[PDB]
């Protein structure tokens, strides 16, 4: 919500309190709270004619541990000039490039989004060090064609393996047409950590991504593909030497409030790693449909359901790797500003 | 204070920073800083004519300790709805419904609520976990009779046994007349954690309370009687298998802004448990009478002092269990908005 | 930014993001993202003709590390009241008072104010459980002339042995002039803490300031000189029986924004204690110039870029207490509110 508009300053101070509850179920049900609040503010200054100042950091604050041991987050912090045609810069703790091709079929009601993305991961998701230069009409010519252009250092030190990276860049470009389709790509390469690069499997991280999505006549579907290398992390922390990712989803929004959802997602691991328990070859790292629905009362409040169907079956690499094969289910109750 | 109402759509932003300091005497005087903020949100959408969304979130900061030491709590995180006469619902972390009961006598000045209520207790104070449904009029039919019906979810795993608690609801009702006089009574029942009933106690936690009230004329005068089953935590982290609580409060607001303050706690263990250093049998766990004061300047700036006589006195169990016997003093002075 | 103003209460909330690189360069470059955000509140309310209320809360979120890891800080957080030619009283965690007399050099664009200047050390900066008295203009007597009166209690456990102190007090005067010098000098008494004492090296620590500033026709000039008295802290724990400190800065503010600066910090440590790899002696704990520049957009928009030559050699001292001797250089860019 707005809470300042003068001399030529805004102040949007906006959040959510989200009620939550997800159960687990295949060998004996069991359910947790998974609650919690999120805050954030958007700063906007203007400058001159040609140039505004920008600034957003967004905080969660987990309500589902008891107090004295609930985690807090800082979600994203950064600030940035924005020139028009020029286009825009900004620097801190932001999304990656890349991420902007994932953001069509990262539309589901509680999943989603969690197959090739995780956050502090090169620049599949929020990471940090991002300086990015984005344009929105490829410089005044092309309306609906908008691209980034995306530097990150290394963050080589003093933190898990996995969630570690080298200096590299990433990029994507977004073609928006009038009739609600639109079409985006996009691409990622950096250095490994030293402290990967040990695992003997190679030097880069990479990854390529396409999307496609129809937004209008109160329908949306999207889909896409995408491919990484060295930098999908498993759930025992090895990295997959090649994914093979497919995501889709169709929704339909209702005008009293009611928007059904069906969602698809796939990682598929190519040429896995022997270990301990398994003898190495391919594997799925995320296989799973999710059926729900949000019923919108309004902008400011929202209750919603979902199941996950996990498709991932019992078997030596989920065994391996700890990785769950369980369906789930969540409920909650949102009120947002 | 309200920072944003439009569109049908209310925000309160409210909190308070309060520089207090906490003495405690018997052998060698000793005393510490317990300065802290808090700040929270409370929203509200009008949805249609009969149905409004509401959200509350609230954020405790320590300032006491040195900074990267200082811990944060999310005291409450809840969504809702309301619908007139037909009630409303909130999910999230939220307190109990019984607390209701234990609402009129926890009006201390700087201890009180700490007998049989907890943080992280079943539904004794703030919890995780609880679904709430209250209706403040019983359907239209009758001012002033209100009440709450609450389901808790089990918190069983990741987190101390003290703080644990299986599936259970708790009720509470409250009759408030129009001459000042309030009458509440409230009922808790719930399966115990399976880490709690290796203990060999039982496998229910239960509660029951009653209170009175007048708050009229510049008086406040309360009294509280409870007790408590497998459900009140001990220093050394037992459970009483039972408790028998009394509170009482009177209090006077003069016009200048002075509020003086005398209350008393008692919480008396019955038949507790054997233990190193201890052969069993009844013991008080809290025994006090609070003397202090506030003087109120306005609605936003007030200041305080208060003493605690401590009555419980050195022996086996207190020595045991490692309850303190010390009496304490506070000041304070509060900035809130 | 003033975010609520009615009924004669005040709130201002104000904050910034700032996104912050910085580089170590001498034996082999790295660099680091050390982006963060801060946000906080100041209240206000009129209580009467002579007596209005106050209170000031401010928070540090990193940004720098990956969520699940980030710390958070409350920097203030404390309660006052004002009473025109009486004065003012705060109580809480905040700037001890000889930090007043420092004030006037901790103007650098990176670095400066981390001599003889640390958190939560003694009345050196901010700091748990102060009592502030303050009047502006020598109970309505001097306009310009100001003063601290200031008293802390004992922080003696449960914290690290170089963040601890006894019970003490600091005080400082500032007389500023229409012509746009002002002058400030301020001294610090305390115990120090029963872990501290241990060390054999005396029963007090203690700290005399003075300052002089230029501020006015776009040029800023200051100069500090302060010693020290088993007060600093090194970097491998052991306290300074005495410091020896000189800082200076200029800087000059052109109309279009530019805002170049130098600086110069030294603390030179006089008998420091014998310790493995180390005889005894003098040695410079602190010795840098910083040479860097912002650029002010607006009020709300700001880059800035610092380069820090580090003058320290790398001698047996620098060696066994762990003090590092490379240069440094740092750019960012804040919006702010
Ligand atoms: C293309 C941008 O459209 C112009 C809108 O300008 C309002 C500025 O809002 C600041 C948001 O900046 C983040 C994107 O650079
Ligand atoms: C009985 C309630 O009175 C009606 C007031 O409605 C204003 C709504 O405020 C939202 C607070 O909701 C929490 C209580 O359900
Ligand atoms: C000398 C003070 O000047 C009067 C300004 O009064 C406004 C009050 O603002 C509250 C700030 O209080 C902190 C300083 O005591």
Redesign the interface.
Known sequence: ????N?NG?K?D?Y?????E?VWTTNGDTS???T???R?G?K?E?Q?NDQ?I?????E???????????????????????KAGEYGSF????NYGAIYDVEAATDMLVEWGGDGWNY??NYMTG?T??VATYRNSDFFGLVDGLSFALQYQ???DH???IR?QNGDGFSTAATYAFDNGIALSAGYSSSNRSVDQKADGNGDKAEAWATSAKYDANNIYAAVMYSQTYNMTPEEDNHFAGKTQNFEAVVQYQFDFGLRPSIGYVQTKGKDLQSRAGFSGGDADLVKYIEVGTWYY??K??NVYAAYKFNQLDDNDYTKAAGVATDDQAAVG?????
Chains 1, 2, 3 share one sequence.
Do not use: C, P
Not at 1 to 4: D, G, L, N
Not at 333 to 337: A, D, K, L
């Open positions: 919500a707005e809470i300042y003068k300053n102040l101070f959040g959510k309190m989200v009620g509850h359910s947790d709270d609650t919690y609040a805050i503010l700063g200054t400058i140039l100042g920008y600034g957003q950091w905080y969660n604050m987990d309500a589902s541990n008891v107090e004295g041991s609930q985690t807090t987050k800082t979600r994203l912090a950064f600030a940035g000039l900004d620097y801190g703790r956050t502090d929020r940090n060090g250092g290394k963050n003093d933190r898990a969630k009362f309004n400011n409040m109750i949102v009120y947002q500003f």
